[PDB]
Design a protein around this ligand. Structure first.
Ligand SMILES: N[C@@H](CCCC[NH3+])C(=O)O
Ligand SMILES: N[C@@H](CCCC[NH3+])C(=O)O
Ligand SMILES: N[C@@H](CCCC[NH3+])C(=O)O
Ligand SMILES: N[C@@H](CCCC[NH3+])C(=O)O
Ligand SMILES: [Cl-]
Ligand SMILES: [Cl-]
Lengths: 248, 249, 251, 252
């Protein structure tokens, strides 16, 4: 388990090459683990993708709303709640793995602490229809490891768009204005990829799907020392009737 | 008339040195904005143009709702007024060929602006009204467009110009989303009364979709460079909604 | 009485919202400038600081003309005043530990600013006077520097700050010129009286060499972040305190 | 010789297509710069060897040391040796290749406009040859639009000698604003290896070579061409320091 990942990473990374990833993580708020920079063995990834497949078919929940705390940006997708995913022993132990968190802490350059609100530890988003999107937003917590389990071709949409070095003002998000002042980075993803995101200071969204395509991710959210008290009444993934949500 | 008036308006607000700085920005971004800090036409001239356009819209508005295969099937959801209709405006047509207007902007393009383009693309009015209306990602067939931001929604409703300079249009392989993955997007917010010069052939651009029923109106004056003086694609959707490259939605 | 007046000076100019915007710029560029549009200290306070430094310069300036091996043999061609001389100044030393100043700037760093650094690096004055004087490409050992641009030449004479944020310092392989080949350089012009906050550990930086015999004078207040505590100093490259440090080479 | 164009046309046809040249044209407009390295050779290795050997003989015979400041570019230094255009034109190979219809035709696909080999006779060709610590080609623009630069010999990147570039700028000789432009714009640094070639948009790209940090050799050949916008142009500035060390704009 841990011993297999410790050996797997030891053959694919050096302190020097991980320091280069830390540069790119702080510069873009984003670092991708693809065929050239794998993070988990293919067996470990298949097991997690299989467990997520059983969880989607069993507990998927449609969402279609505008979130007021992010300028009424849309959330049009299906979700599997954190409390359901936590029952997967595989996903639960892996998210708290001392080998995994220790390795990525060399990229964040600060302690990764698996202590977040129990409704936000894990989240699966499953998009299926044209115009499905995870609109522009920030996270309440500092870190997220995103598993790009199933990604459509880039021509169908689903790319991550990001503006790093921003912050979330839930009473004045200024999202389109911040786009007008800042260059947007678009990150294309392939199935099997993973990426680490600095969610609290990186404004981000997924580009809306142009046709009916399948886009599935797993979100493992972690805290830094900086993450306190939650606010906004905007927990739309856990509560579709949240005060900040406006149904569509 | 307007030429002698425009020449004096520009001479009080620009030097060759400051035009050269605009030429820097126009080559760097494919875009230079004529806002309240850098006016291009007197307020009376724009009011005349906008009034002519609002009549052309009220009379000749033609709704467009399609996908364009030559630009990766990006949408065109708007109303248009065709060039032949707009060319009936003596004002818009005369202004678009003004040797004072073109001579000034040629200090920004650093090359001759030639008012010799196809008779169906000399002028275009687009007019977005409903949620999700957009002028999707595309290039122009010609080098230059002077865009009149006659009416702009508030930025929180969308309608911003997004642009990626230093690209080109391959109609058999546009690679729009792949180009976005490789390049940074510049977003240009626009207020009513703004104009901007756009390098349309090498700047991939779109307008951000309307997040709510809002009004977004522009006039497009398209010009050629010496490099533009044979068309292809079968994709002239604004003049012909039944173009071979237009798909239905 | 410094902290009481400084807190008023800052409360007139800054809000949590405006500081958050500065924190965004500080994270993005490794650098936020406190110029005429964003003053940090009252003019009478900076004047007092600058006169302390000119006295220290007149009494304790030492010429440095060397290359540093831990930063790719980049030059240090300047005069300096050592930290232990500057710490004798009651004004500078107490200001550098001001809970009001450090508390304010911590809203830009978004983390605690800790005035616990090596006694040979709490303060540094660099004083360049001659053509080709430069503070060559380098990083700092600590996270933070507040730089007082006490005297700046005209921009056409050089002396600008050049910076590449989001980098790191490997003293055995600093890769200075290779990093410049892979990254864009931000040049920051400074005027006399400016101050700026610098993320010194992850921002590769230098001062553009003087093209004329002009005078360029700064005060460097260096502080630690939590990450810097307990960590060990390596490199044998403390050239400002020891001109014949092991990593220093003749120029 | 004589059969150089027939072979060069084949060499390019093996490596380049209109689609792939169109990608290079996008980079050239964006950066003012496109590099021909091992992944994208421009000329056969035998042909570059002949050009380098020609340049080595021209250097040993006709080099001239320069150490000055140029006022039309803000007193930035020129600290190097040079070989002037009239001496380089005596090489039948270099002079023929610089007007090659195959070479110019190919590069015109990257410039997206005609490349015209009609420039001032003192500026058709230039070899710069740096040898000593602090040697540099200081920040400047060119009077003409295009230059193909042959990086015949380049030191290790740790020793300096990289190209730095700020594209989408302009040269005002009475007020060049070198350091002000650097404050407003990001600097692109382009490292080079011996054997590389690159195309540069010299009239709108502010550029220099990073000063050598120690005694190393850095040797380039500069083939300068015009665009239509440079034709019948009045040369101004009195700053042609490579031809005339006593040029009015030059300062010792
Ligand atoms: N706050 C985010 C949701 C976080 C999902 C769980 N980490 C948003 O506005 O969409
Ligand atoms: N080529 C443009 C149309 C421009 C018409 C006016 N210049 C498009 O596909 O949207
Ligand atoms: N590390 C710096 C010296 C900083 C001393 C004051 N913080 C250098 O090598 O130049
Ligand atoms: N204008 C350049 C010289 C270019 C000569 C060769 N094309 C300079 O000032 O250094
Ligand atoms: Cl258009
Ligand atoms: Cl040159």
């Amino acid at each position: 388990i841990d011993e297999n990942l410790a050996k797997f990473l030891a053959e694919r990374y050096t302190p020097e090459s991980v320091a280069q990833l830390a540069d790119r993580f702080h510069r873009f708020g984003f670092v991708k683990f693809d065929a050239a920079n794998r993070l988990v063995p293919d067996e470990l990834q298949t097991a997690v993708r299989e467990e997520c497949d059983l969880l989607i078919e069993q507990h998927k929940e449609r969402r279609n709303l505008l979130l007021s705390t992010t300028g009424n940006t849309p959330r049009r997708m299906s979700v599997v709640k954190s409390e359901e995913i936590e029952k997967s022993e595989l996903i639960s132990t892996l998210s708290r793995s001392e080998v995994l968190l220790g390795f990525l802490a060399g990229i964040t350059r600060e302690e990764i602490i698996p202590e977040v609100s129990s409704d936000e530890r894990y989240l699966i988003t499953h998009q299926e229809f044209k115009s499905d999107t995870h609109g522009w937003h920030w996270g309440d917590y500092s870190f997220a490891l995103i598993w790009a389990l199933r990604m459509p071709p880039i021509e169908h949409g689903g790319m991550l768009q990001a503006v790093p070095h921003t912050h979330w003002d839930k009473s004045n998000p200024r999202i389109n204005q911040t786009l007008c002042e800042r260059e947007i980075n678009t990150h294309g993803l392939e199935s099997g990829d993973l990426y680490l995101l600095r969610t609290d200071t990186t404004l981000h969204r997924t580009v809306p799907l142009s046709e009916d395509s399948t886009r599935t991710i797993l979100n493992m959210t972690w805290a830094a020392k900086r993450d306190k008290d939650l606010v906004g009444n905007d927990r739309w993934w856990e509560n579709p009737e949240a005060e900040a949500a406006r149904a569509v």
